[PDB]
Amino acid sequence: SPVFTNSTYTVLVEENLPAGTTILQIEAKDVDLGANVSYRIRSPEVKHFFALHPFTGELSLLRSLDYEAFPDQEASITFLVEAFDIYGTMPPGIATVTVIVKDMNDYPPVFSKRIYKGMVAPDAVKGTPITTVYAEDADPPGLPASRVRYRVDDVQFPYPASIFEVEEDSGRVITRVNLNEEPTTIFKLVVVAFDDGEPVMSSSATVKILVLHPGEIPRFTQEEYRPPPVSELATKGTMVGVISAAAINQSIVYSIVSGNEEDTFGINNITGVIYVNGPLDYETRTSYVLRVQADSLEVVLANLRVPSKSNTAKVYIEIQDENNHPPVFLEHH
Ligand SMILES: [Ca+2]
Ligand SMILES: [Ca+2]
Ligand SMILES: [Ca+2]
Ligand SMILES: [Cl-]
């Protein structure tokens, strides 16, 4: 009847170690034979978690542990192990094992988007705001393991990382230095959100940054254009109204971006004059709302559109009924 070197074992085991990890070695001695002692787990309900090598006495995980999967306060498993002499003589030696599961950081921070966009001026001074990134951490709140911090990464795109920075706590992305870059360029800046858990986990996203002078994005003369009624009878080419913007050093190109799916209207993209393009019918349709936009030649020639507050407007077009002659009185009901 072997006797265990210790009559109880306690061991602390990190959650999320992989299947196979040896976590404890036990030992009993046969005082007579001094050899060939063998071991066995006696509490059959824990063969769900562990295996015990019959000759080495090494205990290992059959599956990784999960701290959060246990009832509150109960993240520990206690059980009996037994040791026999070579013959398997009855009663064996018996000891207690207690495996306590240590809580660990489970999740990385996750960004609200895979790709953020922003803009910056070619000559922007150090500290110009560009955009904010944001990540959340699924781990227990208020702990170092769910505390988010941001930084840039220079492994894949080192240059952007040298002209842009992100504030460690707020996730505001800003210019690191006074800029001197080419209008129309689009940088990819890689940002990383990391926590403060054991271990540390992180993920990353991309901020695409377009270089362009804010002043070279056109400003419409109005937010809402409300030209006079257009007659139901208007022939093709009749003028509806005219939109207009100014931009610094730029030719401007005008367009209709939505609301005109029937091609009932058209726009001269250079003059900004909106005209009747198809047939009109008051019974069929009495009013329209077009979304128009103004862009710089430079931006167009670069196959870009940049919709801002000021280079987008709505045009309200109201049709005039020409077949409206209600009678003097009607014997109605
Ligand atoms: Ca867990
Ligand atoms: Ca955990
Ligand atoms: Ca975390
Ligand atoms: Cl940074």
Numbering used by the authors: 795 to 1127
What's the publication's text?
The tip of each stereocilium is linked to its tallest neighbor by a ‘tip link' filament essential for hair-cell mechanotransduction. Immature tip links are likely formed by homotetrameric protocadherin-15 (PCDH15) proteins, while mature tip links are made of cadherin-23 (CDH23) and PCDH15 heterotetramers. CDH23 and PCDH15 are unusual members of the family that feature 27 and 11 EC repeats, respectively. Here we present the X-ray crystal structures of repeats EC8–10 and EC9–10 refined at 2.8 and 3.35 Å resolution, respectively, which show an EC9–10 calcium-free linker that alters the linear arrangement of PCDH15's EC repeats.
The solved structure of the human PCDH15 EC8–10 (2.8 Å) contained 333 residues starting from Ser 795 (EC8) to Glu 1,125 (numbering corresponds to the processed protein) followed by two histidine residues that are part of the purification tag. Overall, each of the three EC repeats shows an architecture similar to that of classical cadherins, with the typical Greek-key motif comprised of seven β strands forming a β sandwich fold. In addition, repeats EC8 and EC9 feature an α-helix between β strands C and D, also observed in some of the CDH23 and PCDH15 EC1–2 repeats. The first unique structural feature of PCDH15 EC8–10 is a canonical-like calcium-binding site at the EC8–9 linker with a novel torsion between these EC repeats. As expected, the structure shows three bound calcium ions. However, a comparison with PCDH15 EC1–2 and other cadherins reveals that the distance between calcium ions at positions 2 and 3 is larger in PCDH15 EC8–9 (8.48 Å versus an average of 6.84 Å for 41 canonical linkers). In PCDH15 EC8–9, the side chain of Asp 933 in the DXD motif, which usually bridges calcium ions at sites 2 and 3, only coordinates calcium at site 3 in a ‘canonical-like' architecture. The canonical DXNDN linker motif is DMNDY (897–901) in PCDH15 EC8–9, with the carbonyl oxygen of Tyr 901 coordinating calcium. It is likely that the bulky and conserved side chain of Tyr 901 and two proline residues after the DXD motif in EC9 (934–935; also conserved, Supplementary Fig. 4) cause the bending and atypical separation observed between ions at sites 2 and 3. In addition, the EC9–10 linker is calcium-free and bent (90°), with an EC9–10 310 helix and an EC10 FG-α loop that define the EC9–10 interface. Overall, these results indicate that the PCDH15 EC8–10 crystallographic conformation, including bending at EC9–10, is also observed in solution.
